Swiss-Prot record:
Residues 13-148 form the MRH domain. Glycans are attached at N14, N134. The chain holds residues 628 to 769 of 2499 of the full protein. Binds HA-I and HA-II plasma membrane adapters. Interacts with DPP4; the interaction is direct. Binds GGA1, GGA2 and GGA3. Interacts with the heterotrimeric retromer cargo-selective complex (CSC), formed by VPS26 (VPS26A or VPS26B), VPS29 and VPS35; which is involved in retrograde trafficking of the receptor from endosomes to the Golgi apparatus. Changing Y102L: Severely impairs both Man-6-P and Man-P-GlcNAc recognition. It is found in: Golgi apparatus membrane; Endosome membrane. This is Cation-independent mannose-6-phosphate receptor. Contains 15 repeating units of approximately 147 AA harboring four disulfide bonds each. The most highly conserved region within the repeat consists of a stretch of 13 AA that contains cysteines at both ends. It comes from the Eukaryota. Belongs to the MRL1/IGF2R family. It comes from Bos taurus (Bovine). Palmitoylated. Undergoes cysteine S-palmitoylation which promotes interaction with the retromer cargo-selective complex which mediates its retrograde trafficking to the Golgi apparatus. Disulfide bonds join C15-C51, C59-C66, C118-C147.
Amino acid sequence: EAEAEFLSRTEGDNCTVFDSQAGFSFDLTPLTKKDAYKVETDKYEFHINVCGPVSVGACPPDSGACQVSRSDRKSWNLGRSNAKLSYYDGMIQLTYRDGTPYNNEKRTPRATLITFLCDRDAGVGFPEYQEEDNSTYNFRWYTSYACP
């Protein structure tokens, strides 16, 4: 399986994205936090940051997204520091680096894909953990900064 069929992806380098189709430029830099964001589940938390690295005490500073089992205290790397914002027709998505791969034959990196959704008036935004399934962890982020 391939990561997207590639239909309208505008990929930036730093955590700012300008999409030529959409004609709008979005800065997701205020969304970057040193303290970072934490999504909590029953037995795990996902701590992620938009752009750069994540400063969690569960994973090395070179990580941009880190999860830790609040149950076992196991922690995994969900991608090393990166700032690649991609604008996908419809929503903005951020893809993180290889970090730490599972244990599969494909050597598949546990990565974080943050899908930014339009929320007309919210604030900086709150991410929510949706589905790890595509070997990458997808979070939805409701932020006004992702909406025109």
